[PDB]
Design an enzyme around this catalytic site. Structure first.
Site, PDB file in Angstrom:
ATOM      1  CG  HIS A  62      -1.710  -1.228   1.337  1.00  0.00           C
ATOM      2  ND1 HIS A  62      -2.709  -1.630   0.559  1.00  0.00           N
ATOM      3  CD2 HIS A  62      -1.832  -2.266   2.186  1.00  0.00           C
ATOM      4  CE1 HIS A  62      -3.254  -2.776   0.677  1.00  0.00           C
ATOM      5  NE2 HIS A  62      -2.608  -3.222   1.995  1.00  0.00           N
ATOM      6  CG  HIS A  92       2.903   5.917   5.961  1.00  0.00           C
ATOM      7  ND1 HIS A  92       2.567   5.859   7.297  1.00  0.00           N
ATOM      8  CD2 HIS A  92       1.677   6.289   5.287  1.00  0.00           C
ATOM      9  CE1 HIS A  92       1.466   6.446   7.701  1.00  0.00           C
ATOM     10  NE2 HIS A  92       0.849   6.542   6.546  1.00  0.00           N
ATOM     11  CG  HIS A  94      -0.923   8.438   2.123  1.00  0.00           C
ATOM     12  ND1 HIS A  94      -1.727   7.312   2.173  1.00  0.00           N
ATOM     13  CD2 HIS A  94      -0.649   8.820   3.363  1.00  0.00           C
ATOM     14  CE1 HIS A  94      -1.624   6.810   3.477  1.00  0.00           C
ATOM     15  NE2 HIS A  94      -1.123   7.477   4.085  1.00  0.00           N
ATOM     16  CD  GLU A 104      -4.187   9.292   3.114  1.00  0.00           C
ATOM     17  OE1 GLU A 104      -3.760   9.357   4.290  1.00  0.00           O
ATOM     18  OE2 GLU A 104      -4.468   8.741   2.405  1.00  0.00           O
ATOM     19  CG  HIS A 117       0.337  10.264   7.284  1.00  0.00           C
ATOM     20  ND1 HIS A 117      -0.691   9.409   6.668  1.00  0.00           N
ATOM     21  CD2 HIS A 117       0.179  11.712   6.994  1.00  0.00           C
ATOM     22  CE1 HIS A 117      -1.528  10.371   6.097  1.00  0.00           C
ATOM     23  NE2 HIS A 117      -1.359  11.632   6.164  1.00  0.00           N
ATOM     24  CB  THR A 196      -5.847   7.842   6.176  1.00  0.00           C
ATOM     25  OG1 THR A 196      -4.701   7.275   5.840  1.00  0.00           O
ATOM     26  CG2 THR A 196      -6.139   9.299   6.929  1.00  0.00           C
TER      27      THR A 196
HETATM   28  N1  LIG Z   1      -2.275   6.571   7.197  1.00  0.00           N
HETATM   29  S1  LIG Z   1      -2.286   6.716   8.947  1.00  0.00           S
HETATM   30  O1  LIG Z   1      -3.736   7.002   9.210  1.00  0.00           O
HETATM   31  O2  LIG Z   1      -1.260   7.478   9.228  1.00  0.00           O
HETATM   32  C1  LIG Z   1      -1.782   4.933   9.421  1.00  0.00           C
HETATM   33  C2  LIG Z   1      -0.820   4.760  10.398  1.00  0.00           C
HETATM   34  C3  LIG Z   1      -0.809   3.471  10.884  1.00  0.00           C
HETATM   35  C4  LIG Z   1      -1.374   2.514  10.309  1.00  0.00           C
HETATM   36  C5  LIG Z   1      -0.737   1.171  10.652  1.00  0.00           C
HETATM   37  C6  LIG Z   1      -2.067   0.143  11.186  1.00  0.00           C
HETATM   38  C7  LIG Z   1      -2.861   0.533  12.157  1.00  0.00           C
HETATM   39  C8  LIG Z   1      -3.964  -0.614  12.859  1.00  0.00           C
HETATM   40  C9  LIG Z   1      -3.727  -1.931  12.264  1.00  0.00           C
HETATM   41  N2  LIG Z   1      -4.671  -2.724  12.712  1.00  0.00           N
HETATM   42  O3  LIG Z   1      -5.384  -2.336  13.863  1.00  0.00           O
HETATM   43  O4  LIG Z   1      -4.858  -3.883  12.137  1.00  0.00           O
HETATM   44  C10 LIG Z   1      -3.156  -2.097  11.057  1.00  0.00           C
HETATM   45  C11 LIG Z   1      -2.219  -1.118  10.668  1.00  0.00           C
HETATM   46  C12 LIG Z   1      -2.526   2.807   9.385  1.00  0.00           C
HETATM   47  C13 LIG Z   1      -2.683   3.977   8.957  1.00  0.00           C
HETATM   48 ZN   LIG Z   2      -0.823   7.798   6.302  1.00  0.00          ZN
END
Ligand SMILES: NS(=O)(=O)c1ccc(Cc2ccc([N+](=O)[O-])cc2)cc1
Ligand SMILES: [Zn+2]
Ligand SMILES: NS(=O)(=O)c1ccc(Cc2ccc([N+](=O)[O-])cc2)cc1
Length: 258
Positions: A62, A92, A94, A104, A117, A196
């Site tokens: 992703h 990471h 986006h 985002e 992020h 997100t």
């Molecule tokens: N894009 S963001 O909102 O900064 C974001 C940050 C961290 C995560 C990681 C993640 C968070 C939770 C779970 N989970 O509960 O299965 C799996 C992966 C997911 C998304």
């Molecule tokens: Zn993110």
């Protein structure tokens, strides 16, 4: 199948497996700068990354995650809107297929080329997996990227991407200093929201910096050479891995600055 950002499994489909997608505190959102209220009670953000210890970079299908050793209080975010101490676990990005989209969050409907992020968990919950089950479990520091001059501190990340082209590849990635990804100013907006990506948990205090960082066209072009697919599978360029803005509902966005 699985969730993703393709024609058939993108953000508008996620609700079918993650019904919280239609919840009351989803992210990202559009930041209406004129309606965000200056809150003089907000503190300066405290970013303490001097002792940050990066370990590895991973293509998870992703995005790519730069992972940190979060076994000790090193690399912490405090202050701002936060109560207590939040420990850096990973960062990471986006990004888009074109420079005109990729972020985002949006600012008065403006889309940036990408968004960084920096993900932190509240140490009062002991580890990340417990923290995501709490409404104040995470603090994500969001930073916009615009295309212009190169970001020298980003180049080490850009150069390792060739070694993690496809889903499930990782590479050792030690001694990376995330201070090299910050802008000059720490002025910010803040609001309560969510992850997100699935599982879209409503566990995040968002802190979005006003000042974007500049990266070069060549830097972001290298992000767009990554693959969503695994090795030996049909090539799907890793582009447009952003969720669009979600309804603000009953939330207030607060500004740290006048
Ligand atoms: N894009 S963001 O909102 O900064 C974001 C940050 C961290 C995560 C990681 C993640 C968070 C939770 C779970 N989970 O509960 O299965 C799996 C992966 C997911 C998304
Ligand atoms: Zn993110
Ligand atoms: N709700 S969700 O986790 O986003 C999800 C969305 C879609 C699907 C089914 C699916 C159908 C087709 C494709 N495809 O052609 O790549 C991918 C996934 C499965 C699961």
């Amino acid at each position: 199948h699985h969730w993703g950002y393709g024609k058939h499994n993108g953000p508008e489909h996620w609700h079918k497996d993650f019904p919280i997608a239609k919840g009351e505190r989803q992210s990202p959102v559009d930041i209406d700068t004129h309606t965000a209220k200056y809150d003089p009670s907000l503190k300066p953000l405290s970013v303490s990354y001097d002792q940050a210890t990066s370990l590895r970079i991973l293509n998870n299908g992703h995005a790519f995650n730069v992972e940190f050793d979060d076994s000790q209080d090193k690399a912490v975010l405090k202050g701002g809107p936060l109560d207590g101490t939040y420990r850096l676990i990973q960062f990471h990005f986006h990004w888009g297929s074109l420079d005109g989209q990729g972020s985002e969050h949006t600012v008065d409907k403006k889309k940036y080329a990408a968004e960084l992020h920096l993900v932190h968990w509240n140490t009062k919950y002991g580890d990340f997996g417990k923290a995501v089950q709490q409404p104040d479990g995470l603090a994500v520091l969001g930073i916009f990227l615009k295309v212009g001059s190169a970001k020298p501190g980003l180049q080490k990340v850009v150069d390792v991407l060739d070694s993690i082209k496809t889903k499930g590849k990782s590479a050792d990635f030690t001694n990376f200093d995330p201070r090299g990804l910050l802008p000059e100013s720490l002025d910010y907006w803040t609001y309560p929201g969510s992850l997100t990506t699935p599982p879209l948990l409503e566990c995040v205090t968002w802190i979005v910096l006003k000042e974007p960082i500049s990266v070069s066209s060549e830097q972001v072009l290298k992000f767009r050479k990554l693959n969503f697919n695994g090795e030996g599978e049909p090539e799907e360029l890793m582009v447009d891995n952003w969720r669009p803005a979600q309804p603000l509902k009953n939330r207030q966005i607060k500004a740290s600055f006048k």
